[PDB]
Design a protein around this ligand. Structure first.
Ligand code: CA
Length: 241
């Protein structure tokens, strides 16, 4: 029961322009190097893949990323098949979801199906953010501390999150990794916002290094590792029975 699928096999060199929008600059770790990215120069559809490129163009770091203009309800599972072409030190690829039309971050939550950093190069991270976890200023969220530590992100894997009123279930390659559960506190506490807003799909390969003179989580950029790409074979949203 498929609510949405993109196989990136349209007769087009860019992703569906009604569904996918190019990521824009913001002064944060994942967004700082969308600055000066000229249209689709780091984003194409080729050979059935969405290809998101991270590179240094003439001394400027440039990220590759899109986000979905549509969001999805509860009672659904998001599956994204992707690999990195290459491990890149300073590389910061991600597959994740933001609420559409929620209050200021992180009051509507955030779901990360996949982030990779050089600091733990044989795992990925699956993470949840809420106002109840992060408060005003926090940015760590709650992450799967028992994440697979013997994992090769440069092979194809299916990253998934099943979102219901009761819980988020995380999977890698169809295998459950962890659960973030509704505690059913007063709504006032903002502990489980995940069914009050549609959630979109964000696919990016970003570059880390320092943000305002402070080392980001993905850490130092090694220019000799660039360029790198994330290849997304498909995204689908399944409606649960
Ligand atoms: Ca494909």
């Amino acid at each position: 029961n498929i609510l949405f699928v993109d196989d990136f096999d349209a007769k087009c060199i860019v992703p569906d322009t009604a569904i996918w929008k190019l990521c824009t600059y913001a002064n944060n770790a994942w967004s700082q190097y969308f600055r000066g990215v000229d249209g689709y120069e780091n984003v194409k559809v080729e050979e059935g893949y969405l290809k998101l490129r991270a590179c240094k163009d003439n001394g400027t770091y440039k990220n590759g990323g899109v986000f979905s203009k549509i969001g999805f309800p509860c009672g659904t599972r998001l599956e994204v098949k992707a690999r990195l072409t290459k491990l890149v030190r300073g590389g910061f690829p991600a597959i994740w979801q933001m609420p559409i039309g929620a209050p200021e971050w992180p009051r509507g939550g955030q779901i990360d199906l996949m982030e990779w950093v050089q600091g733990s190069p044989k795992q990925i991270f699956q993470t949840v953010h809420t106002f109840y976890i992060n408060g005003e200023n926090g940015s760590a969220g709650v992450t799967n501390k028992e994440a697979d530590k013997n994992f090769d992100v440069t092979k194809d894997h299916v990253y998934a999150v099943q979102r219901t009123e009761k819980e988020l279930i995380f999977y890698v390659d169809g295998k459950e990794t962890w659960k973030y559960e509704n505690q059913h506190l007063d709504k006032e506490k903002l502990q489980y916002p995940f069914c009050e807003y549609p959630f979109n799909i964000i696919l990016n390969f970003s570059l880390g290094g320092e943000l305002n003179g402070m080392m980001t989580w993905p850490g130092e950029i090694h220019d000799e590792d660039l360029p790198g790409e994330m290849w997304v074979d498909w995204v689908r949203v399944v409606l649960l029975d």
